[model samples]
Target: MVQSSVLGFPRIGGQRELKKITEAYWSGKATVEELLAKGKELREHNWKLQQKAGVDIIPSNDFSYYDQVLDLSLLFNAIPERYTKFDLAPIDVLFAMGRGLQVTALEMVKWFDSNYHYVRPTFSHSTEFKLNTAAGIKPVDEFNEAKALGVQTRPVILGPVSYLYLGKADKDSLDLEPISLLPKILPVYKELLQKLKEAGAEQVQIDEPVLVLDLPEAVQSKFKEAYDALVGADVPELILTTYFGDVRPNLKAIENLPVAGFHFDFVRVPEQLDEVASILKDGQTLSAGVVDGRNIWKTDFAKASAVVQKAIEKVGKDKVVVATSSSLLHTPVDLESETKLDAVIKDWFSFATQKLDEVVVIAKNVSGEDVSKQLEANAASIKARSESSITNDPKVQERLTTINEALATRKAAFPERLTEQKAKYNLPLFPTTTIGSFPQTKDIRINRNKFAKGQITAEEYEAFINKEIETVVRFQEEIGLDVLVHGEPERNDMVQYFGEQLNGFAFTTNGWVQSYGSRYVRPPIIVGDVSRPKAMTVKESVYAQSITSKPMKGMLTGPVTILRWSFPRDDVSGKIQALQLGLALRDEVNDLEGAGITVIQVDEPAIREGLPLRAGKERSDYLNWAAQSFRVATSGVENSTQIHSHFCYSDLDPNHIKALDADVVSIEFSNYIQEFSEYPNHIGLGLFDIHSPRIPSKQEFVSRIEEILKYPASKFWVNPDCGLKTRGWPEVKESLTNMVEAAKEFRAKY
Candidate 1:
């Protein structure tokens, strides 16, 4: 029989019960036991669902309260001395590391090149090692839970090499390589694996995902040393899994490793199939990840079956197992919740639950079972999608063909535009503003979800959101903001909100994937041609304008950000997808202009991070289209509309910076140890990192403002690093108050 497996299941529950439970725990509304109980329930339900879907090898330990990397940190007891010194509850210590403690948390960095972030593991010279039995209990208990449900599970762990590979070394050892810690950390993993084996697990899926990265000689050797230590321990069968990229160059290390099998991502690197099949030894299981777990596009089961059949022919049925391309933790769970989605586009997609069924069907087909009904049904869905009217929007296609050459150019040069913006908004030495969004309070989310579920009428929802707008507007005015925004309380997420209202995108119910700690996102599926059916943000921005005398900054998620954050179409260039999104946003920008909302801010936080990791591709291949999209979105507005573009997690690349054609650009700079005065554009040097709960003191804000003033004060704006969507009301209020105070101090001093 061809064994079917999923690399990992989505941790946020089918109904997002885990998100609610975890958020409650963090908010102090629920106890730790309550949160754990919710996790157990989700875990058991996911296991049973996969088993019922006929998944041959279900995944365990894929569930994490925060992140898998943090789990690895706990499993090895790699807590920093500062955290250990506090000596809080074991779980609280882990949570503190993942988010932050009452006042401090471990720093987080982007995971690989993706928007989903990870808690960076901080190490010190004094860091000690121990097997955390409490952390270890999660996997053991999850395995037994699945066993009780009569489903055998394969427990997943972040392989030793990748854990150390993704982490940062101590501040003192900047010159020392991170791979040096591997020699010290291998025993903890060995012990953990042995414990899992003793817990009745037959195979452990150890993920060395970074093997796909451009590996250095030293890093490659570390993989050899680390896996060699655990190859044939008291552990059960070991399948080393690599995903998100191809592991071809590292094949020798994969083949050399003394493991039971090797799992390679065929989804991303399908072309390397024959090469992978040729190298593996006889009797070694070949777990081929034929179904995509990162994207929402439905599997071409016939294509997947063909690949599996070829693998079966090459390695025999028993040796060839079928699995997900990576963890389904990135994609949504079910497609059933998206009633607003176009049936034409919706037919082409598969969420995590659907993907699980597809994996099982692929396995059944490879094993020569009766899956004709499923196969035919899938083919029909694909055929219907290809023939759908919504997939071919003539208006949007026409706009794309008639791309305005002049619209791509800024209204004036950066220096001239900077002068114009400074002259027009001249009031303070360092003007204060925010990254656009204020706080997405609980009431906002509840009402939005109710509207999505059809419990609240659209009229009622609009009124509710308008009330929120009035509340935010009055607060911003009373607080004395230089620029104000209608808190993005109406929107669920920056990307998902745009994806839902746009023509080409579809959403899912259970698509909840962990972004950082307890945070998760349900990335909307981009299935067809992108076009706007209606103005997305105009009503709120326009309504806010009616009430506030302050300049209402119209908020729109930029083209690059929308594309970066969503499960974008595999059929088109990211440039093409972005262009389509630009066209859609252009219409909305015009609508906002017509509705009389000025000082539009298009938040492109993902823009710089989305740059090609390897260059030679013109930054313009992305930026030309990306910047053009922003221009087209905001260009129709008169010059006085005051276009502003915001970027975060960017290094202020000259080329990328030149691409943003906004009147004023706000950037995250609190953690950046550089001067922005050299840049010749209107700049907002971020005064604080808003991701943390701890409010910056007046002194800290004053110092940051002082540091920023070394740049031309005429070109500066004062703001927090990013959106206040995740922050609490008190922190937002206190931080902005200090920010306004700091700006006032600079005003008096200058």
Candidate 2:
């Protein structure tokens, strides 16, 4: 029989138990023992879920308390010096490194192009290669834990080469490449592999997902060297795994490595299967990843079966192991949780638990078993979605036909727009503003929940929201901010708030996907053609500006950000969806301007997050349309209406951002090295880390400004690295007060 395997499972419990319990620990209500117990339960439950589905190869250590990359950092002692000095417990150490305890946390970056984030590991000259005993041998322990449960598991670990490739050098340790530490890192990997075999594991999955990326020849050579050093007689058989994009470009680098098997994502780039199969040696398994692991879409069984059938024909069924496209970490837990979804669209979806069934059915069907009933049902669902009236609107199609290059371009160049904007506002030299949201407090949550549950009348909820808006406006005035926001007190989330107001987007009862540690978002599902019924944020901004003397920036989520963050329709091209969203927002942008709002911020934080993982024509097309989408939304407004955009949590590409042509842009300054001199536009390189509660002194902000000015021009604004939604009122007030003084001090000098 052909075997079925999983790359990984979603760790946030079906009911979000991990997040619920982890937050309990962060607050003072729970102990480390309790938190640790919850992790064990989640892992055990995941394994048993697979076991009950009759899966042949269940994965262990795919579960993470926070992030798997950060787990490897602790296991391999890639701990930055700041985190080690705290003398904390192993799990506490992860929390500190992930979200920060006393000091600022390590940079959290997007995991490839997916919305998922990981705490990036830092390697320095002092990075020791030995495994930390305090962290315990996680793989061996997890393997044995499942063994005790009568479920034999294949423990998965991030590959040594990819680990070094994904990580960055320590801040203080300049001129250091993380890849330089690979030789020293191989011994620890060998030791962990040896322990896994001794603990009765037959094989392990060493994830080298970075093979999918464009790489330097030096980094490519390390994969061979690292694998050669880790090859030991006692070590478990290694199934080298790669996903999300084609590994064909770097196939020569991994072709004849000393591993027992290979896995490729057939769901994403199935054409890779023919080339990938050519390199396999005698009895080396080709883990045929057929089911979509990144999306909520149900498997097209006929398509997935063709992929598995091809793999079997190439190497014979004995050498074929059916698997998933990537980890199910990007997906939600169970379809059963989605009770409130439109019944028609709900049938077209499958979550992590349901995907497991898809894999099993595919493997069984390809092995010549009768899956006629399932296949017939799947075919009906697929045909229904393709021809559904709900998905196609003639009005949207007519609107899309009118889009072109001219529609994406702004009416005037940045210089001309800057002249108009400068004449209109007459703002200070170093202006201060926030990235939209101020904290969504407990009382705010209660008010929102009460309103949502119908405990409060519509009039009462409006009064509550209006009061909060005034409070945010008054606070900004007290801090002497030049540009103010309505504080987004009325918004539930940046994406969801807008999604709820738009047409053709479906809401979920409990479709939670984790973005980072203990932070989750319920992505809206794009069911059909998207449109706007009315203005989303005009009322809030009009009220905010009416109550304040200073200019209030109308806050909005950009088209690309909204599209990327949602569960987009598989049938529609992203370019089409984004453009559809752009037309809708163009209406709102024009409406906001008509209502006398001068400054408007359309945030595209997830724009960088949506860049294609493997660079090619796909990447170029993405940058083009994504930029067009933002422009299409903002271009409707006149030159005097100052356009602002905010980006955070990734290494920002200057060229990609330049295309949007926003009047002023603010980026998360944590990983910035720039070529903004050619930009000739106003930019805010955020001065302080808003994620941390530690209020930086005014002198610190002044020094940061001093350092920034040394590199670039003087068209600058002062702000935090990201929004202040996660912060308390007191912390926000003190932080902004300090920021205002720093900008004023810097203003005096120039």
Who wins the lDDT comparison? 2
For model 1, residues 369-439, the per-residue Cα lDDT tens digits are: 89899899999987776777757777878888877767666566666655565576554667678877776
Please give, for residues 101-208, the per-residue lDDT of candidate 2 as tens digits: 647788888888788999887888887878766678787888999999999999999998889888898878888987888778888898888888999999999999
> TM-scores of the models, in the given order?
0.87, 0.94
Question: Which residue pairs does candidate 2 place in steric collision?
Answer: none
Q: CA lDDT, every prediction?
A: 0.78, 0.87
How many clashes show up per model?
Answer: 5, 0
For model 1, what is the alpha-carbon lDDT of residue 641?
A: 63
